[model samples]
Target: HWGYGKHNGPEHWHKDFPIAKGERQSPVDIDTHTAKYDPSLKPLSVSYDQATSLRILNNGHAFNVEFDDSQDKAVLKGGPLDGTYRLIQFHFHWGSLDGQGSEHTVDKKKYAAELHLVHWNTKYGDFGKAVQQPDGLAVLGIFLKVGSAKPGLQKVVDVLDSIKTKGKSADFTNFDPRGLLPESLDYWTYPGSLTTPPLLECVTWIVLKEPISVSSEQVLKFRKLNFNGEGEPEELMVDNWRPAQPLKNRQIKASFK
Candidate 1:
């Protein structure tokens, strides 16, 4: 499996998943000057059910909170999409320190961290089937800035110890992930790929304009998580972010003017 090490990181992923060099690869640096404001882009509608949030786990790469998506209990609507997209799981990408944790940067400016809310189009029958289509997945990216403590993020932060190593997981019930979002849903939309291995070119990125505040102390807790499982040597799970990919032949449309 490909890990975020010098030899097996993003740069070498192309050898295995050739799509890494493809046209619409993800986590692009948003050159705001080049981004166009399109009034036709509708405001996003996010509906989350607390009970649907199942568990949080350290998947050796990043922290993932899985959701029970057997039904449309939690879904994302509107934006650049035609139908409802069911919210399945959410995760985060971060750096080792305060300044460069986020995957997607704005005008070359990096944030402390980035939260991704992943959704799959229900039209495709299931998540596995949907992930194969061009319009299958819709990921909401929210940048995290280092500032005041975010109470909403605190709940998630507290559970980091339980899932500190790879394959480790714990029950994280009734947790409303929507609480981690910013005040506004204003965002930049573009067609892009999954930022990890198997780099599937199926995600429609909707990166939020406003970032939520997180303290330096809290983000440090994330670094405490290990990439290696018990007794597999001490590999801290910091810098799990993929560098921004090329924007070749792609147009980023803004929901706000």
Candidate 2:
């Protein structure tokens, strides 16, 4: 519950995570409509598991979802995109300081938070192996804003009290990724690299146009997620979010008028 100005502020960020200087992160602003993004090319699925049978594990940098393959789906496609990619694991990105918790920037605005739905082609069967291929993965991104009345997110917030401390994560069961999705699935489909280390240029980023809201308190819980990181609590990693990267010679297509 602490991340204001000095101690864990933005300016001191570089000291904690030196890699921020080179990572292709998110939290940038993008006007969804202006870009000629094609939604038909993106994948939308509902086979995500609602009964979250996930085992949360803390490997330091952040909490991780221990392996549990409990979902399936039919991918959406029409234009820029083709074929179906199945979702595997879902995770989040947030700031170590406060505020700034998004993966893609629209112009220059950073949303409250961002969720990444990681998926791989079922054609490969093995996720680790699939991640290496050019068309191995497809990620759906949803930005979270600050506000009350976020209808479907109570599930996430309800589990916060159990995981409020660092190096601690509980079993988040019976939760649906759909509950966190924005109302309008319309999106901007683009080819981009991973926002973190080992940044692979093998991901199709499907970012939604609509953003969901969460109370300030809920965002606070996200901050509690410390960067226990692999090697000795290097930096508290309070927020652990990477700002958005430049488009860098890429094609961003939208699906609507």
Candidate 3:
């Protein structure tokens, strides 16, 4: 029942989940100047089956597009990962205003929003078990900027009205995750945790440097989403981002110079 409100915000989450204070926490400030450029990094390979996309759900925390990972229908490899990583689900985090929604910041600059495509290591057996181990999950982070309308995103926004409340879900299939990626695969890599609770630190974060463009209107529609279910007091789902955590001694590697 943790949320982004003052009563039970990120600051208070530590009371219930002490790992919230653990090292290698997520959404860290990506200082490009300090990030090491790794030429040895291989180009990321992402393959997703449109038919593998299942349903879209509003889980109070965010709108998640679940994928059918029963088989190797969709997978991610290379780019700071070993073995095959199966696509599980993808979600977004945003704010009430433009240029403030993204959880991750580059050179101290926050984008309009942040998109996370979560994948679990195939070698780990199941997603549940993978989260408990290091190098078990690989989260692809795509930053959203305000500019031209993203036609590919319209399909997603169109269904938000039907699932505005929490626990709401709609049949969503044949959706390709690749349509959501930027032209460039250049990224910053680091070890991090889930942005939300349990806050497991088993993720190998591959944050794309190139951001996808979205219209201002499309961005506002996300704010219209509610954090609570249909019966509870409607809470606008905005500023649903966690503040940047300490990088500590972690080294950030960039795929490009």
Candidate 4:
């Protein structure tokens, strides 16, 4: 019942990111039946990182992570897929399955909620320029639904108390996002654009088919995030999720038949 709507929600996100206007955005309804089988959709590898330097930000729209560049691990080095495609930031989109709040539309249907892991290609050597290339960015999408408690996601929710107020962030040490990932790497691949702005058409998108579950309590915690920092009212910001979008002549291909 909170998180997004008017004033301090998705309706207000553009004021800060500006790029939201162009982002291709995801969570478009994904139909297992219409999947165009493509075997190339498997992830190259699955790696883990204890991102001790991760910081949280409740910028006007969603609670985003402004990642620090110095935290890259060895096996997870920032090379082509390395930290050079450095982790810039991350955020989310959600909705109640009963009524609204889902992002990323498939043929045009919405899911529960979507999480985005944002990265910039360091090939160009600069965050600004990397987003301009064909493979300048890589985003991993995790789908969420109202179901059983997510044991894998407990680590993420554990930090809510630390960031209980808006604009309030503390060093979140020893947390690895990989730990929160699904076991299956089989995914849907497509040449797509940023879900957020600059809406650059230079992204290589990997939308996983498996939807993860989160307890209603954890989801309610997400709803508690406020867009305004300390000075604003205690009103909840980001509300339900974004509905899926049309393919617009686009093709959504899966990794397995």
Candidate 5:
């Protein structure tokens, strides 16, 4: 199966997901000096509902905090996106070491981790169909650095232990994901694909220039998760992030000068 291990890792993903080698691949290295300023790009906006959260589920490769997307309870709009996109779920990508976790990097500099807040256009209705369309998804990439403990991240961290293995899940609700965002939304915008399997090229990636902080103890707790299910050999779900892909001549639009 697809995984971060040698046999099925990012390098070999092209075998099954040919798009892995396609143009506009995600998690591209963000060179601050290279991106062109695009004044036309609007400021990003998010209206999150505290009641949108459903539960947190461990899906082997990564864990996701699923949300109820039937309504526009959580919405992301403006920026490169034409209209509104409803929040569906949010997840993270991390590594074994403190400095190697984030998927996207700044001038080849990696962060401690990255959080992807995923949203979908309601035109498609079905999540499956939505992911296949060109403008179907918009993902906000938030980098995490090791610093003071972030109160916004505490609730999610406390629930990680409850869904520490593949397929494990626990009810999670009454949470506003917006709490995790930094004060500034200055970002880099690009056309990109999903970093994981199937590699759909539908996402409008918004990578925030600023990073949020998480304590050493808090970030380390993520390693407690396992990539295997109950009966399988236990494997820590670390380094579950794909390295930066080539930009391949795609123009990156800077939201801020």
Candidate 6:
């Protein structure tokens, strides 16, 4: 009933999920001029153990690299969060071309791509239980610009051939997600829901101000993957991003001055 398609995209999501029109919807445009800088906002602290990387799967909508969160193998602290959050999974959202695709925009500017690193609060226990509350989750949003070929990204792109179709999965380990982050941890913070369905209003969005580089050729590899299963008509997986929604009354707070 929900996906990034004409029949069940963001516009139609409100029909099934009334929360889609809620006050804290995600992927809002980050207007730098309007965002307030909070001096008290602490620097982001991310500790991701490469060994905790379990596997990567093509879940139709996006490809997620799942992590072992049973223990504190990978954790995020500081910033706007009160407690440490364990790394659960990380995925991406992008458009068909270079002009658009990222869910969250900077100064009303959309980037070529965006990566979401999802984490769950340990105090709330498991992610299943945490996602039910407002402060249950913390997601790190990294912007991607079309520039040089990301050497670190090559490892993930190499495996795309194995999991071209939906439902297909492959073992992926020893990959450090931290290598994908930008030099500066400067970001904007806000309360928002998941971009996908169920649209849980539990995520504390930490959208990074800087962007990592990915060559145009490397970005095209994402399109080679399929959204449908083995037998379905070939549907290229491109533009799998939700359009930026209304800001409503929510305030976008900056972590840097």
lDDT accuracy of residue 110 in candidate 5 = 94
Task: State which candidate, 1 or 2, has the greater lDDT.
Answer: 1
Each model's total of backbone clashes: 1, 35, 1, 36, 1, 1
Prediction 2 TM-score vs. true? 0.76
lDDT tens string, model 2, 1-257?
22323575434554654533433333344656557745345345545543344655544444454435434442423334455566566676666433576768776677777778777766667677766777767788888788875767666666655654556678875556667777687777777656654456567777887888787777777665545333344444445555566555556777667
Model 3 local distance difference test score: 0.92
lDDT value, residue 182 of candidate 6:
86
- lDDT, candidates in the order shown: 0.91, 0.61, 0.92, 0.60, 0.90, 0.90
Q: Indicate the worst ten consecutive residues by lDDT in candidate 1.
A: 45-54
> lDDT tens digits, residues 150-252, model 1?
9888889999999988999999988888789899999999999999987899999999999999888889998899999977999899899999999999999
lDDT for 135 in candidate 4 is 76
- Between candidates 2 and 4, which one is better according to TM-score? 4
| Inter-residue clash pairs, candidate 5 | 95-239
RMSD from true fold, candidate 1: 0.9
Every model's Cα RMSD, please? 0.9, 5.3, 0.9, 4.5, 1.0, 1.0
What's the C-alpha lDDT at position 37 in model 6? 99
Model 1 residue 89 lDDT?
Answer: 88
lDDT (10s digit) by residue, model 3, range 1-257: 68999999998989988989898899899999999999899899888754388899999999999999999988999888889999999999998889698999999999989999999999989999999998989999999999998888888988899899999999998888777989999999999999999999999999999999999989889999999989899889999999899888799999998
Evaluation by lDDT, superior candidate among 2 and 3: 3
Candidate 6 to truth, TM: 0.98
Candidate 3 has its poorest 10 consecutive residues by lDDT at 45-54
Per-model TM against the reference: 0.98, 0.76, 0.98, 0.77, 0.97, 0.98
lDDT string for model 5 (189-247, tens) is: 99999999899999989999999999999888998889999878888989999999999
